[PDB]
């Protein structure tokens, strides 16, 4: 009974995330060690005329942009623990998420070491005009 | 091709909105094409929904510099036979709002103590995971009677946790600067460590040199066996699966093969006791 979520591509991975003390910290370990990026995100089938911000209600992908699925670009949704923030709920779940085209093999890692700039709505260095 | 890790135990007919979907097989059928997700206004993202997901699956076959890998070899399970804890857990069924996953229910450990848990999951929900009690039945009663009323005499998570790193501190302190969990058919033993241990890179002791057994996520610090009062979690455990070594028959049949006094009682302990007899046996003689 039930239907399965992941692949076994990603088994090690959210294994090895799922026990960490840190594991924001264990994902970059991880990558740093040669493993491979978590797979199986929800990429969207967009027009790419996009507003470009980098989290939306609908997917906003401009031409340097892809679209993925909030809570599948989330490493505490992906591995089911606990949100850091201090209210422990997600700011991506809900949401769509524009990673630039150059990082979309890893969205996961994206979201975990970039910054939305609170002014201009997008990634700081992907492309904040400040 | 799939894994049963983080499986989706609901009794939902529908698959998840993309915004909501931790991965792209978990989203609806109705966004699909192509390959990819495509977004339909007018159809809304769920606010209400409670899915179970299994803890069943683990692969602890990680290779990253500074961790410690959990899973050792005979010869390093032998070096350290002072640290060794037999570990069996006796789980109950997911039911009701969910089906298709086990959750901790009994505990036992070579000491001869059995904990109860209330049975709790990893439910997500549109703003996270809620880890809670669920509702669970005990496996189809026959020889899991006994498991029936414990459905009721359990403990919160909570509570359970820092019941083990009490009593495995209160073992280990005078005998090793590790714990190593003996094992037969480690699957759901594992899947019940997600409950009380977590893992990192090596650390030392706050209140001494000794090597790091324990974590409070109360206070983000960490204890040796010596100064674990009040710790929640085990800390870079270490552990050994018995089956895989060349054994053709189930547990009792093959503890039963050198030993005649640890007769089966039925019980999680009992199991856990015959697993770490079974290693010292195969591991010591001959
Ligand atoms: O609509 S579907 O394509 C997605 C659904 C699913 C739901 C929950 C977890 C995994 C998978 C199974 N059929
Ligand atoms: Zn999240
Ligand atoms: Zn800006
Ligand atoms: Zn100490
Ligand atoms: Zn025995």
Redesign the pocket.
């Known amino acids: 009974a039930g239907?399965?979520?992941e692949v076994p591509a990603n088994s090690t991975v959210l294994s090895f995330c799922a026990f960490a003390v840190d594991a924001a910290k264990a994902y970059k370990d991880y990558l740093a060690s040669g493993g491979q990026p978590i797979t199986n995100c929800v990429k969207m089938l967009c027009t790419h005329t996009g507003t470009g911000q980098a989290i939306t209600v609908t997917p906003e992908a401009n031409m340097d942009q892809e679209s993925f699925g909030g809570a599948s670009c989330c490493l505490y949704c992906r591995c089911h623990i606990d949100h850091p923030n201090p209210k422990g709920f997600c700011d991506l779940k809900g949401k769509y998420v524009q990673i630039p085209t150059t990082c979309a093999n890893d969205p996961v890692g994206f979201t975990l070491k970039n910054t939305v700039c609170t002014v201009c709505g997008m990634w700081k260095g992907y492309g904040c005009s400040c | 091709n799939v894994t049963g890790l983080f499986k989706?135990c609901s009794k939902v007919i529908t698959?998840?909105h993309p915004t909501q979907a931790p991965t792209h097989?978990?989203?609806?059928?109705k966004f699909?094409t192509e390959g990819l997700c495509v977004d339909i206004p007018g159809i809304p993202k769920d606010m209400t929904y409670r899915r179970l997901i299994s803890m069943m699956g683990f692969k602890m076959n990680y290779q990253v510099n500074g961790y410690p890998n959990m899973f050792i070899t005979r010869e390093e399970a032998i070096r350290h036979v002072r640290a060794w804890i037999g570990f069996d857990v006796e789980g109950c069924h997911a039911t009701r709002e969910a089906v298709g996953t086990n959750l901790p229910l009994q505990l036992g450990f070579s000491t001869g103590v059995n904990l109860v848990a209330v049975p709790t999951g990893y439910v997500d929900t549109p703003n996270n995971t809620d880890f809670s009690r669920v509702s669970a039945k005990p496996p189809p009663g026959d020889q899991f009677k006994h498991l029936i009323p414990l459905m009721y005499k359990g403990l919160p998570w909570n509570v359970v946790r820092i019941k083990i790193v009490q009593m495995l501190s209160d073992t280990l302190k005078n005998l090793s600067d590790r714990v190593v969990f003996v094992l037969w058919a480690h699957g759901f033993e594992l899947t019940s460590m997600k409950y009380f241990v977590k893992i990192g890179p090596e650390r030392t002791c706050c209140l001494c040199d000794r090597r790091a057994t324990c974590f409070s996520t109360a206070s983000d610090t960490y204890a040796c066996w010596h100064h674990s009062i009040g710790f929640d979690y085990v800390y870079n455990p270490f552990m050994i699966d018995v089956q895989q070594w060349g054994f053709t028959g189930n547990l009792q049949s093959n503890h039963d093969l050198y030993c005649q006094v640890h007769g089966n009682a039925h019980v999680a302990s009992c199991d856990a006791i015959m697993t770490r007899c079974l290693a010292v046996h195969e591991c010591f003689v001959k």
């Open positions: 239907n399965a979520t | 989706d698959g998840l097989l978990s989203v609806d059928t699909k």
